[PDB]
Design a protein around this motif. Structure first.
Motif, PDB file in Angstrom:
ATOM      1  N   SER A   4       0.813  -1.215   0.000  1.00 36.45           N
ATOM      2  CA  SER A   4       0.000   0.000   0.000  1.00 36.45           C
ATOM      3  C   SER A   4       0.847   1.267   0.000  1.00 36.45           C
ATOM      4  O   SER A   4       0.827   2.031   0.969  1.00 36.45           O
ATOM      5  CB  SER A   4      -0.949   0.010   1.199  1.00 36.45           C
ATOM      6  OG  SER A   4      -1.703   1.207   1.235  1.00 36.45           O
ATOM      7  N   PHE A   5       1.587   1.499  -1.078  1.00 39.65           N
ATOM      8  CA  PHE A   5       2.509   2.623  -1.161  1.00 39.65           C
ATOM      9  C   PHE A   5       1.751   3.943  -1.158  1.00 39.65           C
ATOM     10  O   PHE A   5       0.756   4.098  -1.870  1.00 39.65           O
ATOM     11  CB  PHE A   5       3.371   2.515  -2.416  1.00 39.65           C
ATOM     12  CG  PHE A   5       4.200   1.273  -2.465  1.00 39.65           C
ATOM     13  CD1 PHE A   5       5.132   1.007  -1.482  1.00 39.65           C
ATOM     14  CD2 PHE A   5       4.046   0.366  -3.494  1.00 39.65           C
ATOM     15  CE1 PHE A   5       5.888  -0.137  -1.524  1.00 39.65           C
ATOM     16  CE2 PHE A   5       4.803  -0.778  -3.538  1.00 39.65           C
ATOM     17  CZ  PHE A   5       5.725  -1.028  -2.552  1.00 39.65           C
ATOM     18  N   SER A   6       2.226   4.888  -0.355  1.00 36.18           N
ATOM     19  CA  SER A   6       1.698   6.244  -0.343  1.00 36.18           C
ATOM     20  C   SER A   6       2.574   7.223  -1.102  1.00 36.18           C
ATOM     21  O   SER A   6       2.061   8.206  -1.642  1.00 36.18           O
ATOM     22  CB  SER A   6       1.520   6.734   1.097  1.00 36.18           C
ATOM     23  OG  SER A   6       2.712   6.583   1.839  1.00 36.18           O
ATOM     24  N   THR A   7       3.880   6.980  -1.152  1.00 39.42           N
ATOM     25  CA  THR A   7       4.821   7.811  -1.886  1.00 39.42           C
ATOM     26  C   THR A   7       5.709   6.942  -2.764  1.00 39.42           C
ATOM     27  O   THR A   7       6.327   5.984  -2.281  1.00 39.42           O
ATOM     28  CB  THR A   7       5.666   8.660  -0.930  1.00 39.42           C
ATOM     29  OG1 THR A   7       6.799   9.193  -1.625  1.00 39.42           O
ATOM     30  CG2 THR A   7       6.117   7.853   0.257  1.00 39.42           C
ATOM     31  N   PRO A  15       8.537   6.810 -15.100  1.00 39.97           N
ATOM     32  CA  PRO A  15       7.910   5.563 -14.633  1.00 39.97           C
ATOM     33  C   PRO A  15       7.273   4.732 -15.728  1.00 39.97           C
ATOM     34  O   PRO A  15       7.262   3.501 -15.626  1.00 39.97           O
ATOM     35  CB  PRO A  15       6.863   6.069 -13.633  1.00 39.97           C
ATOM     36  CG  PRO A  15       7.407   7.360 -13.167  1.00 39.97           C
ATOM     37  CD  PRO A  15       7.994   7.977 -14.393  1.00 39.97           C
ATOM     38  N   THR A  16       6.745   5.355 -16.774  1.00 39.23           N
ATOM     39  CA  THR A  16       6.061   4.616 -17.825  1.00 39.23           C
ATOM     40  C   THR A  16       7.016   3.900 -18.764  1.00 39.23           C
ATOM     41  O   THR A  16       6.561   3.283 -19.730  1.00 39.23           O
ATOM     42  CB  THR A  16       5.158   5.549 -18.636  1.00 39.23           C
ATOM     43  OG1 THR A  16       5.865   6.753 -18.944  1.00 39.23           O
ATOM     44  CG2 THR A  16       3.911   5.894 -17.850  1.00 39.23           C
TER      45      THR A  16
END
Ligand SMILES: CCCCC/C=C\C/C=C\CCCCCCCC(=O)O
Lengths: 49, 49
Positions: A4-7, A15-16
């Motif tokens: 559950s990453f928040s940052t 990223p893509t």
């Protein structure tokens, strides 16, 4: 999983595009901080951490 | 109102000029996510959403 990453933020690569790249070397550093110290983990920052 | 916005962020637009602009067409998409998934609604991101 239950991460559950928040940052999640990256520099030098977008990223893509990570799925189309090969690397010659990868390192991973890991530790624990408190919630108010998370924004301190970035290039060019100041503070105690 | 009772909206109480926590994230307001715009691309290809400055907030201070929204009052002096006229638009040829406007669309509005709306849905529900959870707190850790809000940062994934932005161009050029990865994740499950
Ligand atoms: C009364 C102020 C007089 C001096 C003003 C000018 C110089 C100092 C300016 C900035 C001080 C920043 C405080 C430390 C912040 C660390 C980072 C963080 O905590 O995330």
């Amino acid at each position: 999983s239950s991460a559950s990453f928040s940052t999640f933020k990256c520099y030098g690569v977008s990223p893509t595009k990570l799925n189309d790249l090969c690397f010659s070397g990868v390192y991973a550093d890991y530790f624990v901080v408190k919630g108010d110290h998370v924004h301190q983990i970035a290039p060019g920052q100041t503070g105690v951490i």
